[PDB]
């Protein structure tokens, strides 16, 4: 853990605390070590309607990164870890198949 | 003739009930697939117990004789069974050399000092053994060259006799108007008991390497693999005791050859020292009238060591 | 010359032929087929010039097999040869793939045992019980040593299964983008509440002080932890392990999981029916392979054999005249009975202390396994791992836990490419 | 105490069947678990307290 | 061999030794249990291949010279020059030593298969069928995996190979 | 021990040798179990 939690960032689940590992700080204890684990925890979710792809000109468009969401009347692209909608453009997506 | 036993001569080693328990026992048995002599008679040895099977619907076997001398001047066992029941008896007998209207019992002509009395096709098996002065008999009568199968034999008697046995004979009913003899050896078996408590199968733990594996694992089904079961130990032969030669034979040769001996009142006195010794010249000297040795025997005069001679 | 003797058997359900190896014995000093190996002399098997896969290992590269109605020896083969068509401008690229599912079994816990030292050593005997006072605090050590490792056995099972705060449930409409999970989810019509696959896992597997303690968690309680993990990973993916469970449709979860291994997401969406058919058949093959668990049976057998051996040491004399305490003292002389009873106490105490030392050595092996099983639970089930071979063979997509009597079984789902072609 | 067999425990009616020469039975691991009463000739199990 | 250590082939001692029960069966089981795991430990470290991969007869690779880790037929047991250096630096009463199941030749075969697999197909054979790719391109992908762009390898191919060969 | 003692006196001396040698052999095997767990743990790291 000193190597993988303190000298770097780990993707190992629950190896460096609960949540998404950001960083850790060591402290000395008598005959032992204490790790202060800093994690990222999401909060306050909302529900949305989604779809895997969007049709335009008879072609299927898929997101480069993110998910399609609908607020009730319009559809947007968002990143998966924080709600931040942008308009769906040809620079945000790629084409594959019909 | 000789025949091949299959799995015969297995008897209940003791009391003690028991259920489904692959129990391992060590005792005196008839080894499986053994070489059993065949007789259709002469005094046979005993040495350690006896297996005795036979086959016949009628009753040709009319008792046995046991003991050390099979003669008078000492006590012996005699087992007979007329149409009534078995009669154990231990007296000093005088046996006919050929023992055998409808009148019978020409076996003996003396029954002195009796110390025990008692009164009361087909396969008739017996197991005889004699341990700590107790003469045990196991038997079973099961209706049908012997066939092939397994059947455990139950105790019949318990006889606190004290009798020694080294030889025995048999008795047959002649015509006027077939039996087997095995012996027991110390072997180990793995005995399978059913839920009723009877012995249904056995493994001889000193036959084919596979049986040694079964006995070590305590099972009759061995799974594929390799099993360490025992060990190989080369044995030494002969006993060679090496030693020196002699050198300073420490010359007895003058004290027994001094030309001028000494009168008794002033007797000479020579003391041996730490030198070589060999009394074989004395004992084997050939000419002597008196030679008596008080402390140690005359032959062990070399297997010892003393300080001052 | 001396050495061990081993017996090579194909199994009594195959044949009764056997060969014998005399370990490091020269073939001239043993007292057909005699074969000399660096491990000794093998008699009763023929040596061939072919090479097979190893079946029964003999040693030094030699194995035995029952193939060529007899018994044979041979130098096992490591595998088939393959030359790779390497060049400096050639590449092989797959055009198709298969979904593979494999199992992995790990022991988590073992039987909790305690022994009352007084009933083992003395067995309801007041003369012996007072003599135990002259040995000090040996029983104090014995009780603490066995209790200290019995408490860890419940901790081992909490750390593997109790990794979820909420008890998650699946919707009644059990149908996920075409994937059929009914063999791994609880089936409302069975003993307690097991999946059809867990039923195979559970169906395939007061003397004189020697007491067995029950586990803290029952098998019904472990099933409820494993069904909550299954519901979370199917409805919420890997989000419930970092906060609140966030719903997402399953077809979209699988597309994310392909992205995480280097495959674009359109490859799944245009082949969704194929991947669902391949997954559903792959899961159905698991019950055939189960209807294996030696890693769990070994734990039960090793402890049972230690408990039986401990009892059997109660019939040793250890240099006394009798093994029975109600015998010695009764017929002998008290001054002498005391010395002989002390020999029985010492011999039986040494047996019991040996038992405890081996339980501490075995407890560390179960804890090491339980730490690995807990690590796999978080990194294989609550997420997607990139560690090679850690979560099954192939590119890790997902895992589903199943409970076992004293352990846990992981079902690993991996992506395996197939049908490569040559390109410049 | 049954003519030499010394022990402690609860005596109960059994359902075993000894052979007509056997006094007592043992279990696996060779511990006495049933006896026969010399007088009444009935088999009794000897569970522990 | 328990008996040969404690008594040493003496019938008086060995008969008295029987009075202590089955200690000599426990000793054998304990030693057998740890002697079987010694081959299991080796088997699980090296047997990480199904096929035995061989390298091509030519050996250009890209500038890299792996001749110090690959087998040399002219050396004993066909070890590499470095596997030879490693093996160049590193009876009685009832006591025996059991041979391993895997010989040193068999272990060299496992390591040469791992070495032939990775130099020609990278890491692909550990997930499925072995897929060949030129070695120079394998190195460029490996730099990409650590956050370095691909042109840094391709424009410095001779420099990276020279540093490797010297190291 | 079997040459300068009668059988009832030699048994006592043989038990002393058995106890001592058995204790030493049982210690030997226990220490190997303790070391065997360590090589196995190392082999698991090498395999990883
Ligand atoms: C998103 O919508 C779902 C329903 O589709 C909400 O879940 C419901 O939550 C309410 C309030 O806790 C419960 O009473 C219902 O039983 C839930 N429905 C189901 C089907 O479980 C969920 O809470 C919504 N999320 C947010 C942030 O509002
Ligand atoms: C979804 O979000 C959109 C964008 O915010 C809302 O639509 C309106 O969009 C026009 C531009 O086309 C803006 O000028 C308006 O201000 C937007 N209105 C609002 C209220 O934001 C739309 O209302 C949202 N839908 C729902 C159901 O809330
Ligand atoms: C005393 O001396 C005589 C002769 O010197 C010894 O006689 C020898 O006896 C052996 C054994 O029979 C013969 O083989 C020799 O041939 C004899 N000697 C001669 C010269 O014939 C005699 O042994 C001596 N006394 C003792 C006790 O040894
Ligand atoms: C890749 O390897 C091939 C051989 O497998 C090379 O082709 C050889 O190229 C050299 C010149 O570099 C010629 O002299 C040989 O005659 C060629 N061999 C054959 C069989 O045609 C090729 O040049 C290599 N590529 C690179 C970039 O080095
Ligand atoms: C990819 O491979 C799979 C087989 O692994 C192919 O699917 C099989 O195709 C055959 C021939 O049409 C059918 O008979 C089988 O029933 C199919 N199997 C399954 C599980 O559906 C698939 O066609 C291949 N894809 C391509 C593009 O060739
Ligand atoms: C998922 O698979 C299960 C079997 O594992 C299917 O259940 C079987 O369905 C057929 C058709 O009704 C029956 O003949 C079998 O008896 C069922 N098996 C059991 C154990 O009940 C189930 O139908 C599948 N689900 C879907 C949606 O296809
Ligand atoms: C790619 O091309 C190579 C040849 O450059 C093929 O190699 C063949 O390999 C087999 C054994 O698998 C040999 O028996 C043939 O002799 C080889 N052919 C040639 C022309 O050398 C290789 O099979 C091709 N790969 C694929 C996936 O088709
Ligand atoms: C020992 O003696 C008792 C009597 O003291 C016998 O008991 C008899 O048992 C039979 C059944 O077997 C009964 O029908 C009798 O009524 C009993 N008699 C009495 C007085 O109760 C017992 O059978 C004898 N045991 C043996 C082995 O003979
Ligand atoms: C691989 O590189 C090594 C050097 O690292 C080459 O081996 C040496 O080459 C020099 C000449 O350049 C000789 O003087 C040495 O005697 C060589 N050493 C040995 C052990 O032979 C080797 O030739 C290179 N391989 C190829 C195929 O070029
Ligand atoms: C039994 O051994 C004798 C020699 O003692 C031999 O002559 C006889 O053939 C053997 N019997 C059998 C059946 O092998
Ligand atoms: C049976 O034999 C015994 C012994 O010789 C004898 O005492 C008894 O009277 C015999 N019985 C008959 C009916 O002859
Ligand atoms: C045995 O019988 C003889 C007479 O034949 C007799 O002198 C002797 O006293 C008897 N022995 C016993 C113990 O009765
Ligand atoms: C049996 O004979 C042996 C000698 O072979 C003897 O020592 C022993 O005392 C005899 N037993 C009886 C009961 O007479
Ligand atoms: C004897 O065993 C058989 C099975 O082999 C069983 O059916 C029968 O009931 C048993 N008899 C008794 C009296 O228990
Ligand atoms: C084992 O025996 C059973 C019959 O009892 C048989 O069905 C099975 O095929 C056998 N196994 C082998 C490996 O021969
Ligand atoms: C066995 O001994 C012979 C000489 O008698 C020798 O030639 C042979 O090499 C020995 N075998 C082994 C395996 O040492
Ligand atoms: C195996 O091949 C060798 C030659 O490599 C030959 O000498 C030997 O006889 C062969 N063995 C058998 C059993 O045919």
Numbering used by the authors:
A (entry chain C): 1028 to 1125
B (entry chain A): 27 to 66, 81 to 140, 153 to 172, 187 to 210, 215 to 247, 264 to 395
C (entry chain A): 591 to 621, 640 to 676, 690 to 826, 854 to 939, 944 to 1076
D (entry chain C): 542 to 590
E (entry chain B): 737 to 826, 854 to 930
F (entry chain B): 980 to 1027
Provide excerpts from the study.
Here we report the cryo-EM structures of the trimeric S proteins from the BA.1, BA.2, BA.3, and BA.4/BA.5 subvariants, with BA.4 and BA.5 sharing the same S protein mutations, each in complex with the surface receptor ACE2. The five sublineages of Omicron exhibit numerous mutations in the S protein, which is responsible for receptor recognition and facilitates fusion with host cells. The RBD may exhibit “up” and “down” conformations in reference to the viral surface, and only the “up” RBD can expose the binding site which is responsible for mediating the interaction with the peptidase domain (PD) of ACE2. This interaction triggers the conformational changes of the trimeric S protein to further expose the fusion peptide in S2, which then facilitates membrane fusion with host cells.
Additionally, the BA.3 sublineage is at a low prevalence for the time being but continues to spread. Additionally, BA.3 has combined mutations from BA.1 and BA.2. Consistent with previous studies, only the “up” RBDs are bound to ACE2-PD. As BA.3-SA represents a mixture of the BA.1-SA and BA.2/5-SA conformations, in what follows we will mainly focus on BA.2-SA and BA.5-SA for analysis.
